[PDB]
Amino acid sequence: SWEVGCGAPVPLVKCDENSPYRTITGDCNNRRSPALGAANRALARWLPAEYEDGLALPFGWTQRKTRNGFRVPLAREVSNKIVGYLDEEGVLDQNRSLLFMQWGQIVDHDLDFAPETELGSNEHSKTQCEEYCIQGDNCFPIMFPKNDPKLKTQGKCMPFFRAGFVCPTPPYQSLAREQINAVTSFLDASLVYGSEPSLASRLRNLSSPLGLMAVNQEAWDHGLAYLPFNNKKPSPCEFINTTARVPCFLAGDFRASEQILLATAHTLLLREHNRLARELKKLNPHWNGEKLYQEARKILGAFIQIITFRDYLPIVLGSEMQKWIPPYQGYNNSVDPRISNVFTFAFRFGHMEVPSTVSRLDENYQPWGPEAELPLHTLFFNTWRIIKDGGIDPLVRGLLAKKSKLMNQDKMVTSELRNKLFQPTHKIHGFDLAAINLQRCRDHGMPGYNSWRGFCGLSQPKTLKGLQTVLKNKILAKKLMDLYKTPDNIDIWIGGNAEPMVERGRVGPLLACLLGRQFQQIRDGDRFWWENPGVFTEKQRDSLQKVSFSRLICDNTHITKVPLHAFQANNYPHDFVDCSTVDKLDLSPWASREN
Ligand code: HEM
Ligand SMILES: *[C@@H]1O[C@H](CO)[C@@H](O)[C@H](O)[C@H]1NC(C)=O
Ligand SMILES: *[C@@H]1O[C@H](CO)[C@@H](O)[C@H](O)[C@H]1NC(C)=O
Ligand SMILES: *[C@@H]1O[C@H](CO)[C@@H](O)[C@H](O)[C@H]1NC(C)=O
Ligand SMILES: *[C@@H]1O[C@H](CO)[C@@H](O)[C@H](O)[C@H]1NC(C)=O
Ligand SMILES: [Ca+2]
């Protein structure tokens, strides 16, 4: 029932528990156990992992091994039969902007990243996974079912490499395999500043004592800053247009350029830092770089917490917001702030909120040029469409005046992600994010749908008609029963997402519970939570309480018309007001008085 353990990274970290600043790595957040929520450690297990062999092998690995006496369906077959749809007509969320989806991905990137095995090597390039589609040792290919179009076109499988685990080792025996969280479990803008000393410093402008983040030297946006390029090869952002040869951006998080609207929101977050620093500098010119960096980082960290907890979670969790995140009653050092393995899958509800197209809008919020609208698949790892096609202003306008996809039991994930996903090194727009989510559920040893239903104190359907009642959908139930045979065997990603949405929310009860718990814990278990007595002065928090995503945009673009409520569905001009009408961030209470 208890063991001793193994040590993955640098075992301890001298803490210096005077420092008023979060570490970069998240270490020293918790004084009793300083490793808690620190990056490059095991994700938390809320339930024991479930592997084919009890230890490490995913359900589905060995054909003759059942789960509860039934074969596990191929991930792509589940994708084709349940997740797919043809008709993008009527699929849009009438009361969520496209920024709703985007903030989800941003928060996600702040909280969890489980890299595939050895990010310190490409070896052993035999290759062979993508070529000969042969299973072995952390090559776990997604095999196509009979009658899959991709059969005809792409080969027998989509490549897939198993997630890294502690101890940071390929061969492992004894205990249950535990995947790594490579970012800080704390909601702390790690996606802007990084989660390792190494990347934190490379991101900084040290060359001047102003505590600024590095900016693009090779290009600019009407004088406004771009993130610096990653001059790493092979650059997938170069690969998607070898003519344009415009590389990926360098950010606190390595997924920053995965799509143009994530790269965009990263660009906004960086500018805010530099803006915040330059402001602080003026008020307090006696402050060195370090002090400005940290004080800006600290304010940026709060902005993310507040937009997340005050604006985003209430319209994800809906009725269930109070049940799982009651109002803040201060830091609790007994709460475990770590991101759970299951969260990293629950948060992929976002994938059903991504629509098929992205718009560039002009100052009249009307089509920017004759190619205003682009398919999402052409915008993966696409930086050149920012740099040479009007910078971020047209793209941010689209985040405001366009809609998220609405999650839909007959229209789950757009074919832009479900058939055309680009993965670096693999050359084609030919991958499936849904199939990858399911394979990854199994990779991570996820307990099934009913285990998690029991965890959240909810009924555990055993029959078709039981599942019909919970999904409130005869035909979706029937397809799942036909593929999985028992609700116990349904992968949590698709089980969770199949449930109809709670009142005023965008996730069902199961996900509401799994998400709500995690957000509760990263808040209550955070020493540096913005509302914690002593982190911010009482006046500093009256200033922070007024930030909005509407304000972030006004201060960091040349956009002069915004909604007040950026996550709601907003039509121009009826729901738009001038940037003048929007509460500003008053940095008065940061005025420091000394020698
Ligand atoms: C165009 C939009 C998006 C794209 C292209 C995208 C793509 C991806 C990809 C490629 C992965 C890694 C897949 C794997 O290896 O298992 C991933 C993981 C993930 N995505 Fe998305 N995603 C998008 C939007 C979102 C949104 C909106 C959310 C949430 C609101 C979200 C949440 C996540 C989470 C939680 C993970 C797991 C991260 C980890 O811990 O490793 N994504 N996404
Ligand atoms: C660092 O700051 C100075 C302005 O103080 C600027 O001219 C220089 O380009 C900056 N370097 C980077 C890479 O951001
Ligand atoms: C590559 O970018 C150039 C301009 O840099 C553009 O005119 C051209 O159409 C692009 N081609 C593709 C396939 O994106
Ligand atoms: C902190 O949380 C734990 C459960 O995680 C609970 O037992 C306790 O009531 C909380 N402690 C305080 C002092 O509120
Ligand atoms: C839009 O968002 C929230 C609830 O989802 C609420 O404040 C408002 O009434 C909603 N408006 C609608 C559904 O038109
Ligand atoms: Ca973080």
Curated annotation (Swiss-Prot):
Q: Specify where it is mainly localized.
A: secreted
UniProt gene name? LPO
Report the SS bond pairs. Answer: 6-167, 15-28, 129-139, 133-157, 237-248, 456-513, 554-579
Question: What is this protein called in UniProt?
Answer: Lactoperoxidase
Q: Where is this site: Transition state stabilizer?
A: 255
Question: What is the required cofactor set for this protein?
Answer: Ca(2+); heme b
Please report which protein family the annotation says this sequence is part of: Belongs to the peroxidase family. XPO subfamily.
Q: Where in the cell is it found?
A: Secreted; Cytoplasm
Q: According to its record, what are the GO cellular component terms?
A: basolateral plasma membrane; cytoplasm; extracellular space
Phylogenetic classification of the source organism: Eukaryota, Metazoa, Chordata, Craniata, Vertebrata
- Origin organism is Bos taurus
Q: Which UniProt keywords apply?
A: Antibiotic, Antimicrobial, Calcium, Cleavage on pair of basic residues, Cytoplasm, Disulfide bond, Glycoprotein, Heme, Hydrogen peroxide, Iron, Metal-binding, Nitration, Oxidoreductase, Peroxidase, Phosphoprotein, Secreted, Signal
- GO BP: antibacterial humoral response; defense response to bacterium; detection of chemical stimulus involved in sensory perception of bitter taste; hydrogen peroxide catabolic process; response to oxidative stress
